[PDB]
Ligand binder design. Structure first.
Ligand SMILES: CC(C)CP(=O)(O)O
Ligand code: NA
Length: 387
């Protein structure tokens, strides 16, 4: 029934973060070229105006990703690419600063992914009004998704996206919405209705396509009993160690233990396939603009009055060649542990393929540096998490 057997085959993926939905920490140069107030795609496009925005963003859409990216992904042993796209690619709302033109590039991605033997997971990453208040939704600040006609507008966009892509076997799965922020104020009951509607849309166009649901930052197993359907419905949980005070304080051994505990207590408790649809090699929040442009870092005490653990100058910018052998070794230990833990359930999708230099966050960097394994058998350290 299913284009990809999420029940019985492991996902090994990367995200194309920052490509069709721009994010300051992923491409700081583009935001900094429009000044201090350009802190998300909304403000960036608004500052530039429609003509200049289309010029600068389209330059990036074209240059950031080629067919050779996808071939390198396949060479790294991957079988999936998760591709963020904003609602505005399917038509900016009246009054939106956003420009479109992204779909021509997503069309190319589907072609290139197919040629390389990869599946694509299309991810609706930003919804009208913002589902999370994060910069990566398009507009940081408030959560106004579920107000007014925002949800209907989201479904209108989703429908067009599904219609456009679900005729291709390359597109194995589609995600309802990236990181709906339940603790931030998204209503779960209404979210579940949106999920029900998304499932109907997918089944109008191709019942063979899997539907991906984010856990909304609730424990993934809490979603037991909702749309439990084998390979058809896949939960997406995002697992990071730098956005919580407990995890960020850990040493490498403790980080690794926490990954295994997460797999055993959460991934293995879900009644559905669960991809870890975002995770990374970094263990600090030092990357420039990671908490938002104009915000600092927990790690060095510059965010939320957290107490400094260490300095961020080494890990804020640049490429892992700048680090020591031991630092790369520890980073690889943490990556191997996640690969093995997350393959206990349904697999994994690394965040992200490519940056302007954010140590531990850039798979293309880590691969070339020998930090990222290229197969399940490619292990420099003992297996850290077991059945
Ligand atoms: C804090 C985290 C969960 C959200 P962002 O910093 O990635 O936007
Ligand atoms: Na790190």
């Amino acid at each position: 029934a299913s284009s990809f057997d999420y029940n019985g085959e492991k996902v090994r993926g990367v995200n194309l973060g920052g490509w069709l939905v721009l994010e300051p920490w992923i491409t700081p140069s583009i935001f900094d070229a429009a000044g201090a107030e350009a802190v998300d795609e909304w403000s960036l496009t608004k500052i530039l105006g429609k003509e200049e925005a289309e010029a600068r963003l389209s330059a990036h859409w074209k240059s950031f990703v080629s067919a050779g990216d996808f071939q390198r992904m396949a060479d790294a042993g991957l079988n999936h690419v998760r591709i963020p796209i904003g609602y505005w690619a399917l038509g900016p709302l009246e009054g939106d600063p956003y420009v479109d033109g992204q779909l021509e590039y997503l069309d190319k991605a589907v072609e290139w992914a197919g040629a390389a033997g990869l599946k694509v997971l299309i991810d609706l990453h930003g919804a009208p009004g913002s589902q999370n208040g994060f910069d990566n939704s398009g507009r940081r600040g408030a959560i106004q998704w579920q107000q007014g006609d925002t949800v209907e507008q989201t479904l209108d966009a989703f429908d067009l996206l599904a219609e456009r892509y679900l005729g291709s076997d390359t597109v194995a799965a589609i995600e309802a919405i990236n990181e709906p922020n339940i603790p931030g104020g998204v209503d779960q009951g209404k979210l579940q209705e949106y999920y029900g509607s998304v499932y109907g849309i997918v089944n109008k166009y191709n019942a063979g396509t899997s539907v991906v649901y984010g856990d909304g930052f609730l424990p993934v197993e809490s979603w037991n009993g909702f749309k439990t359907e084998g390979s058809k419905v896949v939960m997406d949980t995002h697992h990071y160690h730098m956005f919580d005070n407990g995890l960020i304080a850990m040493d490498i051994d403790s980080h690794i233990d926490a990954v295994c505990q997460f797999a055993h207590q959460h991934l293995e408790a879900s009644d559905k396939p669960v991809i870890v649809g975002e995770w990374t090699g970094a263990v600090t929040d030092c990357a420039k603009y990671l908490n938002g442009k104009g915000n600092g870092a927990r790690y060095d005490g510059s965010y939320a009055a957290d107490k400094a653990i260490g300095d961020c100058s080494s890990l804020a910018t640049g490429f892992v060649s700048k680090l020591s052998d031991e630092e790369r070794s520890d980073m690889r230990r943490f990556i191997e542990a996640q690969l093995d833990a997350f393959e206990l359930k349904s697999g994994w999708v690394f965040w992200t393929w490519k940056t302007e230099g954010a140590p531990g966050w850039d798979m293309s960097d880590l691969l070339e540096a020998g930090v990222f394994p290229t197969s399940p058998d490619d292990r420099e350290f003992p297996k850290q998490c077991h059945h």
